[PDB]
Amino acid sequence: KVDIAGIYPPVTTPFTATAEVDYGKLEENLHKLGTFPFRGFVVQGSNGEFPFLTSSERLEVVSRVRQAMPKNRLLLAGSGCESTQATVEMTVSMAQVGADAAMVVTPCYYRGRMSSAALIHHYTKVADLSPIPVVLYSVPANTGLDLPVDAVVTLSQHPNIVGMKDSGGDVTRIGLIVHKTRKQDFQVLAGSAGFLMASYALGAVGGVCALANVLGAQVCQLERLCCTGQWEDAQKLQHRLIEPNAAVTRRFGIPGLKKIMDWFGYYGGPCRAPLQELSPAEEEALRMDFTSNGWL
Amino acid sequence: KVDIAGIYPPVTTPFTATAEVDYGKLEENLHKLGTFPFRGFVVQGSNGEFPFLTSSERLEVVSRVRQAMPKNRLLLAGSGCESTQATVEMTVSMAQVGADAAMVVTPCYYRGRMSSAALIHHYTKVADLSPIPVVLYSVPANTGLDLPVDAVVTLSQHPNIVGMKDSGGDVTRIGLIVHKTRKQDFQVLAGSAGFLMASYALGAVGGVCALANVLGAQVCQLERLCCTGQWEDAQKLQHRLIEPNAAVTRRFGIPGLKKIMDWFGYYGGPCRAPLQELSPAEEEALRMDFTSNGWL
Amino acid sequence: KVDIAGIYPPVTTPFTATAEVDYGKLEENLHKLGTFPFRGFVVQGSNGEFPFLTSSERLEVVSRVRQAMPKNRLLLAGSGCESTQATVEMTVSMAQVGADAAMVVTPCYYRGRMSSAALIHHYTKVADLSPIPVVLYSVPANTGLDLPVDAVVTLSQHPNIVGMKDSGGDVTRIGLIVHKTRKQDFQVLAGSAGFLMASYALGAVGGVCALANVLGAQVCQLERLCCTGQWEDAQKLQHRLIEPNAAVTRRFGIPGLKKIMDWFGYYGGPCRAPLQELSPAEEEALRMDFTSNGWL
Amino acid sequence: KVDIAGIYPPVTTPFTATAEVDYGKLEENLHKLGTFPFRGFVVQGSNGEFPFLTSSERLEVVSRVRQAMPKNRLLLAGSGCESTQATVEMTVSMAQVGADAAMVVTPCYYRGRMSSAALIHHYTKVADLSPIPVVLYSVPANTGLDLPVDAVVTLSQHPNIVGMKDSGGDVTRIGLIVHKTRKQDFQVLAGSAGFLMASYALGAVGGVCALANVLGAQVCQLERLCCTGQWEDAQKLQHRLIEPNAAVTRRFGIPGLKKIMDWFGYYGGPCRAPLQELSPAEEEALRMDFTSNGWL
Ligand SMILES: [K+]
Ligand SMILES: [K+]
Ligand SMILES: [K+]
Ligand SMILES: [K+]
């Protein structure tokens, strides 16, 4: 199956002044981001505001991104839904419009009953029925749960489950996942630029990083430094990405990411309600996280 | 606007052996539950597996429940979605098929950015555009977040926001909400039978209780004892509902609730994947929580 | 053994300008607090800054309080240490200087290994070797842990373990503890004034309340209203104590409590380092919590 | 001031069958551990059961360890107490019996009031008054709190605060601390062997690792591989230390560590109550974590 190693920005969904998906701005942004040596794009991931899109919007976004992308760049499409059957259908439909692989977030509304066995069954079914490879996706900042290690190890054995994006930032956990799945075809990607160097050191083979929407060359440079054994230079660059990374993830989220996109000359624009614009104090804090690290 | 005081079971969604909504079993269960002096039914709440239904299923369930209900029983319909615009549309559509009021869960996927201001704006918009009264719904066991008190107080002032269901079980918080909204038309309902007596003592005026799907007469009796000042008898009954309540909520959730429904002669049946059947050990623990408190 | 029902303030330790224990101010405060119909005093509890005192100070504080107290008021002395053997020795020494009962906080530094069995063994040993009755004390805001219900139930069977102070504010948990220990001589006290009415409703028989250091008559009035079935008046008073209670506990802690003591004419004075004075903003917020509820 | 870079085991306190400190077994263990190229010993750290020792035992343990140690090995002594004044006195007394530096755990009982300012003031005072260099110590598994980054950065400026041991395992946080204190004389040590390689990659210069009590050569080898740029071999070794490290820290704690010490031929022996022996199931799980990684 495919090779998912490398760097991807999880791309945003631009909206118009009336909250419609702005496909013109989407295409413009993607053409700009195309200049960086990314493996591809993560589309309708958390940073894409997928919970705020209709079924049909979610599908058409994947379809349009496929058209604005080179054939040899990998389209990793967010197809995860709460129900297993809905996830199957979304995964099939996204494959049909050209997704190379399906990145499937853990169901999480019923967190108390999302046991290892439940999650194993969910992902096994999706992987069984998906015409494209499946990538597991654990993101406790949004879901309140880690996909358990025992479940990851079991799932890594499935022929159609090719890797995972872990956004939790626990490199002891990530190291253990790499180690325990070493006999399988199973590639681990970091879910943020803040712990990317450490992830590479522990055996992860790339990153899906919101920060790459604005510092794409720097995140790719970090990958290069890690892959060529330049760990001292990698350290220095990694250090300077920590605060800007926190700014567009844990601190200010997608509103922070879109604001910084605006300031860098991309179309950031509005989020969909209930997400709101940053307060002036938040804007200033966001600015400082970039300026004090030499990026703005 | 309506008076929402009283007891409601948040009704389940029965499914067939092929995971389709079983409307026959739904109607049969509702006719049975109709015998208890509930204020009404909460439909497509958390216990209804609403995240696992399609838009259309969610709507048709509300429509069918309205048909199987007396006109003077209150249909409180779960219309909450992640996006504000989707919530508006679902709320309008549910009103159109006969919902008396809309119970609107807090958006929660982007928990880090669900500030008081964001949630205020979300609920204000929905309440502005809803043709039926809005009931706030805070359930941190599923969402990972409490609707903040300051937001509740602000929202209580809206003419079209008539109350709240709090499932968090913090009676200091609930007491404070009652106290701070005392000048408004704003009725608080407990979200579980485990803290119902204490909620009444603090000024809540009812409960939406999963446990009422199986111990409806007992939950209604508890209401009666609290409303008539029989606090000593209320205490004894409340004590005996704690473990059975924990069993069908925090311990074993909807799978536990549906299993106990089966054992009591209702149609419990299967959950939709990814929810799974109880393990034999879990079944036994569930059984013990009911038997040791004299209910089975 | 004794009857521990009723209200107690957990008294502070006054310090001089040079951080020495101010026994003169201690005696003056206690004589003032003696006017309220408390069951007694909780001495060297969390609000007494016991972790900041030497062994000898902790003992001499209990000794001096005993001298400044009526013989028929109950001295409940905080004797809990991390180690079981140290707890035994402190409990014996405090008994020797006149403590009526020992209130024993859960060891908590090694929280990951403080299992039910470990805590059962700890309290069983202390109760075995203590010449005075033992009161369990669970306070997760300071310890990060709840004494587990199964451990409480087992321990309630010990002839020398006569009750518990629970500060966690979970009235479902407290209701369950009352219910499961109903066959034992085991009295439950709430650990704060914020959930006192609900605690009484669920079968607790009193409260150890930091707030009683400044609103002693009001907390005692609340007890009276609960014990005489005046639940409607109890509700109104309970509502008005919630914010002032939060102010001197979860919001501003002992520095908040001592500041309000100053403002009410008691000696509040300084805490021992590392505790610090309130910032001006914190002072103002503290003031507002009291003034907006009609107490200042 | 000293150079604290390198590996240290935080040594245990052996106890006799009657719970007395077994200084004979302590000396025997230390002589054995002396064979590894550690920088020194961490004495009366968390793994030493310091909360369970008397003042005098804590002091005499440091004194005896100093006697059983080479003059050129660094004695890093745990002198942290809840109160600032007690910490000062313990730090001075430990210096007097030969400690090279004082490792000072964050006060944590009053966690809600342990603000950055409070912790800054606490450590500034201790560092002002200590005749030996101070090492900050953050260990949220035991304290429930992280020493905040802003406080660490401020404190790193003090001439007598020479570094920190962080046990929290968050390499984004550790990377940020290294980066923000880069202009100061301030050395960061990892607090466990599970994230040691990643810590080195991010700019930490050593580790205080419970695991080094039993796999001292392996932890030192890991240091060597990181310091010589052998990251591929470092990865493989780091992977194999993760589960054994979890076993003697987060899973089974000091009882697990002492049991494995027994099995490796050291004196592990009993913990002080309330710590208990492992259950047979826990013993078996501990065994498996070592055997499945090739260490036993
Ligand atoms: K695979
Ligand atoms: K209203
Ligand atoms: K007893
Ligand atoms: K320094």
Residue numbers in the entry:
A (entry chain A), B (entry chain A), C (entry chain A), D (entry chain A): 32 to 327
Sentences from the paper on this structure:
4-hydroxy-2-oxoglutarate (HOG) aldolase is a unique enzyme in the hydroxyproline degradation pathway catalyzing the cleavage of HOG to pyruvate and glyoxylate. The crystal structures of the apoenzyme and pyruvate-Schiff base intermediate complex are the first for any HOGA enzyme to date and reveal a tetrameric structure composed of a dimer of dimers as well as the identity of active site residues. As mentioned briefly above, the crystallographic symmetry of the hHOGA crystals generate a tetrameric assembly containing a dimer of dimers. Residues 26–259 form an (α/β)8 TIM barrel domain, while residues 260–327 form a three-helical bundle at the C-terminus.
The inclusion of 10 mM pyruvate during crystallization improved diffraction substantially and allowed for in-house data collection to 1.97 Å resolution. An omit Fo-Fc map contoured to 6.4 σ shows clear continuous electron density for the imine Schiff base adduct between the ε-amino group of Lys196 and pyruvate. In this binding mode, hydrogen bonding interactions are observed between the hydroxyl group of Tyr168 and the O(1B) carboxylate oxygen atom of pyruvate. Additional hydrogen bonding interactions are present between the backbone amide nitrogen atoms of Ser77 and Asn78 and the O(1B) and O(1A) atoms of pyruvate, respectively. A network between Ser77, Tyr168, and Tyr140' from the adjacent monomer is also formed. A superposition of the apoenzyme structure with the pyruvate adduct (RMSD  = 0.19 Å for Cα atoms) reveals no significant structural changes to the active site other than a water molecule within hydrogen bonding distance to Lys196. The crystal structure of hHOGA in complex with pyruvate illustrates how the highly conserved G-X-X-G-E motif fulfills the same carboxylate-binding role via two backbone amide nitrogen atoms. The Schiff base intermediate observed within the hHOGA crystal structure and the inactivity of the K196A variant support that this residue plays the same functional role in hHOGA catalysis. The crystal structure of the enzyme in complex with pyruvate has enabled the modeling of the HOG complex and led to the identification of key active site residues. No electron density was observed for the first six residues of hHOGA and the three residues remaining from the affinity tag. The final structures for the apoenzyme and Schiff base adduct exhibited Rwork/free values of 21.2/24.6% and 19.6/21.6%, respectively, and were of high overall quality, as indicated by the refinement statistics in Table 1.
